[PDB]
RNA sequence: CGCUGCUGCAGUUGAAACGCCCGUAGUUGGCCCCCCGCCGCCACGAGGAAACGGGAGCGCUCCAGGCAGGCCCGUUGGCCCCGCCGCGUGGGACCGCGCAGCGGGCGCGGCGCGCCGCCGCCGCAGCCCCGAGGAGAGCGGGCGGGGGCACCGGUACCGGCCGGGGACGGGUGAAACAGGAUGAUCCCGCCGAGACCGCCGGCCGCGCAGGCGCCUGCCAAGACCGCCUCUGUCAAUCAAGGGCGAAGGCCGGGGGCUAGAAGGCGAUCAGACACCACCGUAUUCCCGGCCGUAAACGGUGCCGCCCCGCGGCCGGCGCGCGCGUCCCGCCGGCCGCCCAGGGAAACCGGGAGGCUCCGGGCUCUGGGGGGAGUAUGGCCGCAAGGCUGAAACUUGAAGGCAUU
RNA sequence: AAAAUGGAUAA
């Protein structure tokens, strides 16, 4: 069931059946929307903001308390990461494996994990390219991964 | 092993065939 | 391009003569001398072999003794690893 | 036909097991197809039960006991009678006798 | 990937009615699986149905009066010629007299009898008996 | 699994049967065309031949008998085939260097029953029917 | 007991997995903690897997856990 | 002849899931958004050569025939078929493909409409489905003979010692060859070497398989679970291609203890050049290469979903009890018995069940038994060989599970 | 510890 392993697990997060704003003690919409943007200037990633309101504030799903998803609220203020968060997170991990491999060409299990981690990047970027989230010129290169990362 | 011995016998015939071809080529 | 289909690239000078196996070692012990290596002090890949064992950073201009065909030879990256531990043992 | 479902080995989820040798034959059978019956016995034969302790100077000394696992091969075991050829009905039952 | 919602869902209905299972559960629901069930309930092969609108995949409830034999889907959904609807009937129907093959026609989801009354043809969705 | 259960998998489905179909032995002998070349009779119902020498082939070990046969040389493709002179006492009529007609044994070229090495029959000797010279209707 | 899937006993849905329920949804909820200066509600994520900090303090109110997040100070049940 | 399997094949053992993974062609794909275009489609048409197939009538004397015939419809000789992915009219279910603001006026746009405009004109609710028991991610929490690199102990075995010290010592089925008064075997204190990680070691665990078990240190990695985190169909399965793949082999360095292909040797018998001893090279070990095979096995492809009780283990993860490493379990696995049910049966039953009452998707592979993985044509490989892969020709059985 | 063999053809 996992894209790159024979694992069929179902560990999933949940959203409420009644889709209505938090009656525990929710904040003003413009204020929460500004608050998410304020935390993104400090560099907080989109998953981390959704998590921060869930523990720090009053609701895990920003869409019910606000009007829309964490990245649409951030996008209007231009805070949508230029490379979509999903691609970037995997690209970060691939470089760290490349570093471990640089010292020793002996590790084989790690080479299997690179030929798997980077396979997903080519597939997800390809989805982003047609969707226009990623420009057509952009393409992942293993040698140039660090340069793309920064 | 009886079928593997047959496979070994074939491989030797196949190998003798390649040396014989070389002599006549 | 594809000047040499096989890896007989560097050994394409010897030509038809010499033998397959005899040219085969040369492709690894001649690719070694020609290739640049990293200056330990400058971290730039400019070190080449001035003469057997004499190796000079073309950019750094330092000179470091090294294995005859590679700046860092296999038996010595073991011995250096040994002398680092053994010095620490005293202190 | 499949005489037994375990197929003659206890290898489950691994695909490999470490291999040992028959105490007798010296045939190499993977740990899963191995008799392995634990042995604990008095070092002198119980025939010299207390004849040794009466001879022993030191007070309250107990006869040493060996605690060794004996690992035999399937072929060696049936011919040394460590386990017999059971009936089709008898094979499923475990319950170490 | 759950390639067909209807096939698994129809196998599950049939599975419950062999174990009796008066109350049956369908987990992934599509409009077609509702249209098949109203056709079945109207026929009376199944007593009634409902769907709990959880705000995700909408699970389906199925009530069977217990009088059901085999209910399967025909996919690949071959469109059938109006003239030869019967050839598919010969293979999938227990007796020309009883049984139902639900087809999809422009006028709307229609059974085998309605199709030949209108002399119309459609893609076979499934057989319920 | 026949699978390929796709509305748009007719191309795959058409070829999969065409490729696998040749595997069936009867179809493969039938349309490969290897036999249309191999058949000494060339696929003809019968073919003319010249008698080369009468031969005796012992029958299979369960049935011990000396079958009597004639080696004939096909006129069309100069193939040396072995035909079985049929019935009883037929060999006396057959002569060496004599024209002969040869036809299949009816198993589709395979040997029929216990005759080792024989796949064809002698319908006519020197034009006159073998059966006729045996039923007496037409003699030598 | 002629209960049918249409109305399952509340405890059954509460016992089963939060996706295998006739009505699927959140297992977790908001549980309060007590802080200096507070006898009122201080809600926090019940299953916090990240650090929450004492309001206007340096110390962290909830210990990190894969499951429901544990605490080192006085705490208040669910919503009050 | 469901012996070709679209209807409608078989692949656990009869013949046959490629060792596995990655993956582009293809091929296949959740749910949802009545009410319009382009499809595919659905129905009906029109127009497409008769013969021919059928088909209405008509006694060639029957008939196979024929368009005849009779005081007859303008007497006949019709009629349905050329299938036709062509071309029209209709209808919108399923099924795909639709980025993009709408609007009024000026426009009766030089016989009526249009286009490209032209603006704010305040008209329109202007414009974020949902969050798959699909995934891709995020954090936390533990889990593990999962991988690399070092660091690294322990005995055993073998070789060299020193102090004995006193005779045969191995070796086997019984022996024999070797070792010994050059003091053997035996002990005990060493010393050198390389392998190996015992017992714990398992209906244990982990890995994509092959496989994986000394000590610490070190990096990167992985499922699973928890989850009021994040996107938002990114999915499935695979040609071609890319990686990995026990053992043995092989190439270039090294090593070198023990076993030990070959080789010698003893006994062994008719002969054993076999089995059992004894000696031993390659090999085993290591680092960089090739090779590409296995009874690579669960002889069971890959995702998907429902499916009956009793269980054991294992990893998280909860709720009550007294409060325990309890009890009920919730999920991911590892397994034993098995209710249906299936099958020729052995028997699978967490499928080999939900099939002749046959149709979720993708891929491979077989078609009586030999010849035959043979020949040749490639291609890959240093080779050894691997992958693809014949035919002529033969034969009646070969073969599965059972019962006596 | 040492033990190899048994024509064909029907019964």
Coordinates of N, CA and C (backbone and C1' of nucleotides) in Angstrom, one line a residue, chain A residues 1-16 24 46-48 50-51 54 58-63 67-72 85-86 89-90 93 96-97 99-100 103-104 106-110 112-113 115-116 119-120 123-124 126-127, chain H residues 20-25 128-139 146-150 207-210 218-238 242-245 287-288 302-305 331-333:
Chain A
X1 N 0.8 -1.2 0.0 CA 0.0 0.0 0.0 C 0.9 1.2 0.0
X2 N 2.0 1.2 0.7 CA 2.9 2.4 0.7 C 3.4 2.4 -0.7
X3 N 3.7 3.6 -1.2 CA 4.1 3.7 -2.7 C 5.4 2.9 -2.9
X4 N 6.3 3.0 -2.0 CA 7.6 2.3 -2.2 C 7.9 1.1 -1.3
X5 N 6.8 0.6 -0.6 CA 7.1 -0.6 0.2 C 5.8 -1.5 0.2
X6 N 5.8 -2.8 0.5 CA 4.6 -3.6 0.6 C 4.0 -3.4 2.0
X7 N 3.6 -2.2 2.3 CA 3.0 -1.9 3.6 C 1.6 -1.4 3.5
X8 N 0.6 -2.0 4.2 CA -0.8 -1.6 3.9 C -1.4 -0.9 5.1
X9 N -0.6 -0.2 5.9 CA -1.2 0.4 7.1 C -2.2 1.5 6.8
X10 N -2.9 1.9 7.9 CA -3.9 3.0 7.8 C -3.8 3.8 9.1
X11 N -2.6 4.5 9.2 CA -2.5 5.5 10.4 C -2.8 6.8 9.8
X12 N -4.0 7.4 10.1 CA -4.4 8.6 9.4 C -4.9 9.6 10.3
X13 N -4.7 10.9 10.0 CA -5.3 12.0 10.8 C -6.8 12.1 10.6
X14 N -7.5 12.9 11.4 CA -9.0 12.9 11.2 C -9.5 14.4 11.2
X15 N -10.7 14.6 10.6 CA -11.4 15.9 10.5 C -12.8 15.7 11.0
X16 N -13.4 16.7 11.7 CA -14.8 16.5 12.2 C -16.0 16.3 11.2
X24 N -14.7 25.8 21.0 CA -13.9 25.8 22.3 C -13.5 27.2 22.7
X46 N 4.3 24.9 6.2 CA 2.9 24.8 6.2 C 2.3 23.7 7.1
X47 N 3.0 22.5 7.2 CA 2.5 21.5 8.1 C 2.7 22.0 9.5
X48 N 3.9 22.7 9.8 CA 4.1 23.1 11.1 C 3.1 24.2 11.6
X50 N -0.1 24.3 10.7 CA -1.4 23.6 10.9 C -1.2 22.9 12.2
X51 N -0.1 22.3 12.5 CA 0.2 21.7 13.8 C 0.2 22.8 14.9
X54 N -3.1 23.7 16.2 CA -3.7 22.5 16.9 C -3.2 22.4 18.3
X58 N -6.5 26.8 18.8 CA -7.8 26.2 19.1 C -8.3 25.2 18.1
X59 N -7.7 25.1 16.9 CA -8.3 24.1 16.0 C -7.1 23.5 15.2
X60 N -7.2 22.2 14.8 CA -6.2 21.6 13.9 C -6.5 22.0 12.5
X61 N -7.8 21.9 12.1 CA -8.0 22.2 10.6 C -8.3 23.7 10.5
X62 N -7.4 24.4 9.9 CA -7.6 25.9 9.8 C -8.8 26.2 8.9
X63 N -9.1 25.3 7.9 CA -10.2 25.6 6.9 C -11.5 25.9 7.7
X67 N -11.5 30.4 6.3 CA -12.3 30.1 5.1 C -11.6 29.1 4.2
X68 N -10.3 28.9 4.4 CA -9.6 28.0 3.4 C -8.3 27.3 3.9
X69 N -7.7 26.5 3.1 CA -6.5 25.7 3.5 C -5.3 26.6 3.9
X70 N -4.4 26.0 4.7 CA -3.2 26.8 5.2 C -2.4 27.4 4.0
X71 N -2.3 26.8 2.9 CA -1.4 27.3 1.8 C -2.2 28.3 1.0
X72 N -3.5 28.2 0.9 CA -4.3 29.3 0.1 C -4.3 30.6 0.9
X85 N 5.8 22.5 -1.0 CA 6.4 21.9 0.2 C 6.7 20.4 0.0
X86 N 5.8 19.7 -0.6 CA 6.0 18.2 -0.7 C 7.3 17.8 -1.4
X89 N 10.5 18.8 0.7 CA 10.9 18.0 1.9 C 11.6 16.7 1.4
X90 N 11.2 16.1 0.4 CA 11.8 14.8 -0.2 C 13.2 15.2 -0.7
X93 N 15.7 15.4 2.0 CA 16.1 14.1 2.5 C 17.1 13.4 1.5
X96 N 20.7 14.4 2.0 CA 21.4 13.9 3.2 C 21.9 12.4 2.9
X97 N 21.0 11.7 2.2 CA 21.4 10.3 1.8 C 22.7 10.4 0.9
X99 N 25.0 12.5 0.9 CA 26.2 12.8 1.8 C 26.7 11.5 2.4
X100 N 25.8 10.7 3.0 CA 26.2 9.5 3.7 C 26.9 8.6 2.7
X103 N 30.8 9.3 1.5 CA 32.0 8.7 2.3 C 32.2 7.2 1.8
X104 N 31.1 6.4 1.8 CA 31.3 5.0 1.5 C 30.4 4.5 0.3
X106 N 30.2 1.5 -0.2 CA 29.8 0.2 0.3 C 28.3 0.0 0.5
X107 N 27.7 1.0 1.3 CA 26.3 0.8 1.7 C 25.4 0.6 0.5
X108 N 24.6 -0.5 0.5 CA 23.8 -0.9 -0.6 C 22.3 -0.5 -0.3
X109 N 22.0 -0.8 1.0 CA 20.6 -0.5 1.4 C 20.3 1.0 1.2
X110 N 21.3 1.9 1.5 CA 21.1 3.3 1.3 C 20.9 3.6 -0.2
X112 N 19.6 1.8 -2.4 CA 18.2 1.4 -2.7 C 17.3 2.5 -2.2
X113 N 17.7 3.2 -1.1 CA 16.8 4.2 -0.6 C 16.9 5.4 -1.5
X115 N 17.5 5.3 -4.8 CA 16.9 5.1 -6.1 C 15.4 5.0 -5.9
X116 N 15.0 5.1 -4.6 CA 13.5 5.1 -4.3 C 13.1 6.6 -4.0
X119 N 13.1 8.7 -7.1 CA 12.1 8.3 -8.0 C 10.8 9.1 -7.7
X120 N 10.5 9.2 -6.4 CA 9.2 9.9 -6.0 C 9.3 11.4 -6.5
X123 N 8.4 11.8 -10.1 CA 7.0 11.7 -10.3 C 6.2 12.9 -9.7
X124 N 6.5 13.3 -8.5 CA 5.7 14.5 -7.9 C 6.0 15.8 -8.6
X126 N 6.7 16.0 -11.7 CA 6.0 15.8 -13.0 C 4.6 16.2 -12.8
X127 N 4.0 15.8 -11.7 CA 2.6 16.2 -11.4 C 2.5 17.7 -11.3
Chain H
rC20 P 9.9 -12.6 -8.5 O5' 10.1 -11.3 -7.7 C5' 10.3 -11.3 -6.2 C4' 11.1 -10.1 -5.8 C3' 10.8 -8.8 -6.4 O3' 9.7 -8.1 -5.7 C1' 13.1 -9.1 -6.5
rC21 P 8.7 -7.2 -6.5 O5' 9.4 -5.8 -6.5 C5' 9.8 -5.2 -5.3 C4' 10.9 -4.2 -5.5 C3' 10.6 -3.0 -6.5 O3' 9.9 -2.0 -5.8 C1' 12.7 -3.9 -7.0
rC22 P 8.9 -1.0 -6.5 O5' 9.8 -0.2 -7.5 C5' 10.4 1.1 -7.0 C4' 11.3 1.6 -8.0 C3' 10.7 2.1 -9.3 O3' 10.1 3.4 -9.2 C1' 12.6 0.8 -9.9
rG23 P 8.5 3.7 -9.5 O5' 8.5 3.8 -11.1 C5' 9.2 4.9 -11.7 C4' 9.7 4.4 -13.1 C3' 8.6 4.1 -14.1 O3' 8.4 5.3 -14.9 C1' 10.1 2.2 -14.0
rU24 P 6.9 5.9 -14.9 O5' 6.7 6.3 -16.4 C5' 7.6 7.3 -17.0 C4' 8.0 6.8 -18.3 C3' 6.9 6.5 -19.3 O3' 6.4 7.6 -19.9 C1' 8.6 4.8 -19.4
rA25 P 4.8 7.7 -20.3 O5' 4.8 7.0 -21.8 C5' 4.2 5.7 -21.9 C4' 4.8 5.1 -23.2 C3' 3.7 4.3 -24.0 O3' 3.2 5.2 -25.0 C1' 5.5 2.9 -23.6
rC128 P -15.7 29.0 -5.9 O5' -14.2 28.5 -5.7 C5' -13.4 29.1 -4.6 C4' -12.4 28.1 -4.1 C3' -13.0 27.0 -3.2 O3' -12.6 25.7 -3.7 C1' -11.4 28.2 -1.9
rC129 P -13.4 25.0 -4.9 O5' -13.4 23.5 -4.5 C5' -13.5 23.0 -3.1 C4' -14.9 22.7 -2.8 C3' -15.1 21.9 -1.5 O3' -15.2 22.8 -0.4 C1' -16.4 21.0 -3.2
rC130 P -14.4 22.4 1.0 O5' -14.6 20.8 1.1 C5' -15.5 20.3 2.1 C4' -15.8 18.8 1.8 C3' -14.8 17.8 2.4 O3' -15.3 17.3 3.6 C1' -15.1 17.4 0.1
rG131 P -14.6 17.6 5.0 O5' -13.1 17.0 4.9 C5' -12.9 15.6 5.4 C4' -12.4 14.8 4.2 C3' -11.0 14.1 4.4 O3' -11.0 13.0 3.4 C1' -10.9 15.6 2.7
rA132 P -10.1 11.6 3.8 O5' -10.3 10.8 2.4 C5' -11.5 10.6 1.8 C4' -11.7 9.1 1.4 C3' -10.6 8.2 2.0 O3' -11.2 7.0 2.5 C1' -10.6 7.9 -0.3
rG133 P -11.9 6.8 3.9 O5' -11.0 5.8 4.7 C5' -9.6 5.6 4.3 C4' -9.3 4.2 4.4 C3' -9.8 3.3 3.3 O3' -9.0 3.2 2.2 C1' -10.2 2.3 5.5
rG134 P -9.5 3.0 0.7 O5' -8.3 3.1 -0.3 C5' -7.2 4.0 0.1 C4' -6.3 4.2 -1.1 C3' -4.9 4.7 -0.8 O3' -4.0 3.7 -0.3 C1' -5.8 5.9 -2.6
rA135 P -3.1 4.0 1.0 O5' -2.2 5.3 0.5 C5' -0.8 5.1 0.2 C4' -0.5 5.9 -1.1 C3' 0.5 7.0 -0.9 O3' 1.8 6.6 -0.9 C1' -1.4 7.8 -2.0
rG136 P 2.8 7.0 0.3 O5' 3.5 8.3 -0.2 C5' 3.9 8.5 -1.5 C4' 4.0 9.9 -1.9 C3' 4.6 10.8 -0.8 O3' 6.1 10.8 -0.7 C1' 2.6 11.8 -1.5
rA137 P 6.8 10.2 0.6 O5' 6.1 11.1 1.8 C5' 6.9 11.9 2.6 C4' 6.4 13.3 2.5 C3' 6.3 14.1 3.8 O3' 7.5 14.7 4.2 C1' 4.2 14.2 2.8
rG138 P 8.3 14.2 5.5 O5' 8.3 15.4 6.5 C5' 7.4 16.6 6.2 C4' 6.6 17.0 7.4 C3' 7.2 16.4 8.7 O3' 8.3 17.2 9.2 C1' 4.8 16.4 8.7
rC139 P 9.4 16.4 10.0 O5' 8.7 16.1 11.4 C5' 8.9 17.0 12.5 C4' 7.9 16.8 13.6 C3' 8.1 15.7 14.5 O3' 9.1 15.9 15.5 C1' 5.9 15.6 13.8
rG146 P 18.6 -6.5 12.9 O5' 19.2 -6.3 11.4 C5' 18.5 -7.1 10.4 C4' 18.3 -6.3 9.2 C3' 19.5 -5.5 8.6 O3' 20.4 -6.4 7.8 C1' 17.7 -4.1 8.6
rG147 P 22.0 -6.2 7.9 O5' 22.3 -4.8 7.1 C5' 22.3 -4.8 5.7 C4' 22.9 -3.5 5.2 C3' 24.3 -3.1 5.7 O3' 25.3 -3.7 5.0 C1' 22.8 -1.2 5.9
rG148 P 26.7 -4.0 5.7 O5' 27.5 -2.7 5.6 C5' 27.8 -2.1 4.3 C4' 28.2 -0.6 4.4 C3' 29.4 -0.4 5.4 O3' 30.6 -0.7 4.8 C1' 27.7 1.1 5.9
rC149 P 31.7 -1.7 5.5 O5' 32.8 -0.7 6.1 C5' 33.1 0.5 5.5 C4' 33.2 1.6 6.5 C3' 34.1 1.4 7.6 O3' 35.5 1.5 7.3 C1' 32.2 2.4 8.4
rA150 P 36.5 0.2 7.4 O5' 36.5 -0.2 9.0 C5' 37.6 0.1 9.8 C4' 37.3 1.3 10.7 C3' 37.6 1.1 12.2 O3' 38.9 1.5 12.4 C1' 35.4 1.9 11.9
rG207 P 11.3 -4.1 8.2 O5' 12.4 -4.6 7.1 C5' 13.5 -3.7 6.7 C4' 14.4 -4.4 5.7 C3' 13.8 -4.9 4.4 O3' 13.6 -3.8 3.5 C1' 15.2 -6.5 5.2
rC208 P 12.1 -3.4 3.0 O5' 11.6 -4.7 2.2 C5' 10.6 -4.6 1.2 C4' 11.1 -5.2 -0.1 C3' 11.9 -6.4 0.0 O3' 11.1 -7.6 0.1 C1' 12.9 -5.0 -1.6
rA209 P 11.3 -8.6 1.3 O5' 12.7 -9.2 1.0 C5' 12.9 -10.6 0.8 C4' 13.2 -10.9 -0.6 C3' 14.5 -11.7 -0.8 O3' 14.2 -13.1 -0.8 C1' 14.6 -9.8 -2.1
rG210 P 14.9 -14.1 0.3 O5' 16.4 -14.2 -0.1 C5' 16.7 -15.0 -1.3 C4' 18.0 -14.6 -1.9 C3' 19.3 -14.8 -1.0 O3' 19.8 -16.1 -1.0 C1' 19.3 -12.6 -2.0
rC218 P 28.1 7.7 19.4 O5' 28.3 8.1 17.8 C5' 29.5 8.8 17.4 C4' 29.8 8.4 15.9 C3' 28.7 8.7 15.0 O3' 28.9 10.0 14.4 C1' 29.6 6.5 14.6
rC219 P 27.7 11.1 14.5 O5' 26.4 10.3 13.9 C5' 25.7 10.8 12.8 C4' 26.2 10.2 11.5 C3' 25.1 10.0 10.5 O3' 25.0 11.2 9.7 C1' 26.4 8.0 10.7
rA220 P 23.7 12.1 9.8 O5' 22.5 11.1 9.6 C5' 21.5 11.3 8.6 C4' 21.8 10.3 7.5 C3' 20.6 9.3 7.1 O3' 19.6 10.0 6.4 C1' 22.6 8.1 7.3
rA221 P 18.0 9.8 6.9 O5' 17.6 8.3 6.5 C5' 17.8 7.9 5.2 C4' 17.5 6.4 5.1 C3' 16.1 6.0 5.6 O3' 15.1 6.2 4.6 C1' 17.8 4.6 6.6
rG222 P 13.6 6.6 5.0 O5' 12.8 5.2 5.3 C5' 12.9 4.2 4.3 C4' 12.7 2.9 5.0 C3' 11.3 2.7 5.7 O3' 10.3 2.3 4.8 C1' 13.1 2.0 7.1
rA223 P 9.1 3.2 4.5 O5' 8.1 3.0 5.7 C5' 6.8 2.4 5.5 C4' 6.8 1.0 6.1 C3' 5.7 0.9 7.2 O3' 4.5 0.4 6.7 C1' 7.9 0.2 7.9
rC224 P 3.2 1.2 6.9 O5' 2.6 0.8 8.3 C5' 2.7 -0.6 8.8 C4' 2.9 -0.7 10.3 C3' 2.1 0.4 11.0 O3' 0.7 0.1 11.1 C1' 4.2 0.3 11.9
rC225 P -0.5 1.2 10.9 O5' -0.8 1.7 12.4 C5' -0.8 0.8 13.4 C4' -0.3 1.5 14.7 C3' -0.9 2.9 14.9 O3' -2.3 2.8 15.5 C1' 1.4 3.0 15.4
rG226 P -3.5 3.8 15.1 O5' -3.1 5.1 15.9 C5' -3.0 5.0 17.3 C4' -2.3 6.3 17.9 C3' -2.7 7.6 17.2 O3' -4.0 8.0 17.7 C1' -0.4 7.6 17.5
rC227 P -5.3 8.1 16.7 O5' -5.5 9.7 16.6 C5' -4.9 10.6 17.6 C4' -4.1 11.6 16.9 C3' -4.6 12.3 15.7 O3' -5.6 13.2 16.1 C1' -2.3 11.9 15.4
rC228 P -7.1 13.2 15.4 O5' -7.6 14.7 15.7 C5' -8.6 15.3 14.8 C4' -8.2 16.7 14.5 C3' -6.8 17.1 14.9 O3' -6.1 17.7 13.8 C1' -8.5 18.6 15.8
rU229 P -4.8 17.0 13.2 O5' -3.7 18.1 13.0 C5' -4.0 19.2 12.1 C4' -2.7 19.7 11.5 C3' -2.6 19.7 10.0 O3' -3.0 20.9 9.5 C1' -0.7 18.5 10.9
rC230 P -3.9 21.1 8.2 O5' -2.8 20.9 7.0 C5' -1.7 21.8 6.9 C4' -0.8 21.3 5.8 C3' -1.4 20.9 4.5 O3' -1.7 22.0 3.6 C1' 0.2 19.3 5.2
rU231 P -3.2 22.3 3.2 O5' -3.4 21.5 1.9 C5' -3.1 22.1 0.6 C4' -2.1 21.3 -0.2 C3' -2.7 20.4 -1.3 O3' -2.6 21.1 -2.5 C1' -1.3 19.1 0.1
rG232 P -3.9 21.5 -3.4 O5' -3.9 20.5 -4.7 C5' -3.0 19.4 -4.8 C4' -3.8 18.1 -4.6 C3' -5.2 18.2 -5.2 O3' -5.4 17.1 -6.1 C1' -5.2 17.3 -3.0
rU233 P -6.2 17.3 -7.5 O5' -6.0 15.9 -8.2 C5' -4.8 15.5 -8.8 C4' -4.5 14.1 -8.6 C3' -5.4 13.1 -9.5 O3' -4.6 12.1 -10.1 C1' -5.5 12.5 -7.2
rC234 P -3.7 12.4 -11.5 O5' -2.2 12.4 -11.0 C5' -1.7 11.4 -10.1 C4' -0.5 12.0 -9.3 C3' 0.1 11.0 -8.3 O3' 1.1 10.3 -8.9 C1' -0.1 13.2 -7.3
rA235 P 1.5 8.8 -8.6 O5' 0.1 8.2 -8.0 C5' 0.0 7.6 -6.7 C4' -1.2 6.7 -6.7 C3' -1.1 5.3 -7.4 O3' -0.4 4.4 -6.5 C1' -3.0 6.4 -8.2
rA236 P 0.8 3.5 -7.0 O5' 0.1 2.3 -7.7 C5' -0.9 1.5 -7.0 C4' -1.7 0.6 -7.9 C3' -0.8 -0.3 -8.8 O3' -0.4 -1.5 -8.2 C1' -2.5 0.7 -10.1
rU237 P 1.1 -1.8 -8.0 O5' 1.3 -2.9 -9.2 C5' 0.2 -3.7 -9.7 C4' 0.3 -3.9 -11.1 C3' 1.7 -4.0 -11.7 O3' 2.1 -5.4 -11.7 C1' 0.4 -2.6 -13.0
rC238 P 3.7 -5.8 -11.8 O5' 3.8 -6.1 -13.4 C5' 5.0 -5.7 -14.1 C4' 4.6 -5.2 -15.5 C3' 5.8 -4.7 -16.3 O3' 6.5 -5.8 -16.9 C1' 4.0 -3.2 -16.5
rG242 P 19.7 -1.4 -19.1 O5' 19.9 -0.7 -17.7 C5' 20.2 0.8 -17.7 C4' 19.7 1.4 -16.4 C3' 20.1 0.7 -15.1 O3' 21.4 0.9 -14.7 C1' 17.8 1.0 -15.1
rG243 P 22.4 -0.3 -14.3 O5' 21.9 -0.8 -12.9 C5' 22.6 -0.4 -11.7 C4' 21.6 -0.4 -10.6 C3' 21.7 -1.6 -9.6 O3' 22.9 -1.6 -8.8 C1' 19.5 -1.2 -10.1
rC244 P 24.0 -2.8 -8.8 O5' 23.5 -3.8 -7.6 C5' 23.0 -3.3 -6.3 C4' 22.0 -4.2 -5.8 C3' 22.4 -5.7 -5.7 O3' 23.0 -6.0 -4.5 C1' 20.2 -5.5 -6.7
rG245 P 24.1 -7.2 -4.5 O5' 23.3 -8.5 -4.9 C5' 22.7 -9.3 -3.8 C4' 21.8 -10.4 -4.5 C3' 22.6 -11.5 -5.2 O3' 23.1 -12.4 -4.3 C1' 20.8 -10.7 -6.5
rC287 P 35.6 -6.9 2.1 O5' 36.0 -5.5 1.4 C5' 37.2 -4.7 1.9 C4' 38.0 -4.3 0.8 C3' 37.3 -4.0 -0.5 O3' 36.7 -2.7 -0.5 C1' 39.3 -5.2 -0.9
rG288 P 35.3 -2.5 -1.4 O5' 35.8 -2.7 -2.9 C5' 35.5 -1.6 -3.9 C4' 36.5 -1.7 -5.0 C3' 36.0 -2.2 -6.3 O3' 35.2 -1.3 -7.0 C1' 38.1 -3.2 -5.8
rC302 P 2.2 -11.2 -5.0 O5' 2.3 -9.7 -5.1 C5' 3.3 -9.1 -6.0 C4' 2.8 -7.9 -6.7 C3' 1.7 -7.2 -5.9 O3' 2.2 -6.3 -4.9 C1' 1.0 -7.4 -8.2
rC303 P 1.4 -6.3 -3.5 O5' 0.1 -5.5 -3.9 C5' -0.3 -4.3 -3.2 C4' -1.1 -3.4 -4.1 C3' -2.6 -3.3 -3.8 O3' -2.8 -2.3 -2.8 C1' -2.4 -3.8 -6.1
rG304 P -3.5 -2.8 -1.4 O5' -5.1 -2.8 -1.8 C5' -5.6 -1.8 -2.6 C4' -7.0 -2.2 -3.1 C3' -7.8 -3.0 -2.2 O3' -8.3 -2.2 -1.1 C1' -8.1 -3.8 -4.4
rC305 P -8.4 -2.9 0.4 O5' -10.0 -2.8 0.8 C5' -10.9 -2.3 -0.1 C4' -12.0 -3.4 -0.4 C3' -12.4 -4.2 0.8 O3' -13.5 -3.6 1.4 C1' -12.2 -5.6 -1.2
rC331 P -9.7 -2.7 14.0 O5' -8.1 -2.8 13.5 C5' -7.7 -2.3 12.3 C4' -6.5 -1.4 12.5 C3' -5.2 -1.8 12.0 O3' -5.0 -1.5 10.6 C1' -4.9 -1.0 14.2
rG332 P -4.4 -2.6 9.6 O5' -2.9 -2.0 9.4 C5' -2.1 -2.7 8.3 C4' -0.7 -3.0 8.9 C3' -0.3 -4.5 9.0 O3' 0.0 -5.0 7.7 C1' 0.3 -3.4 11.0
rG333 P -0.7 -6.3 7.2 O5' 0.1 -7.5 8.0 C5' 1.4 -7.9 7.4 C4' 2.4 -8.1 8.4 C3' 2.7 -9.5 8.9 O3' 3.6 -10.1 8.0 C1' 2.5 -8.0 10.8

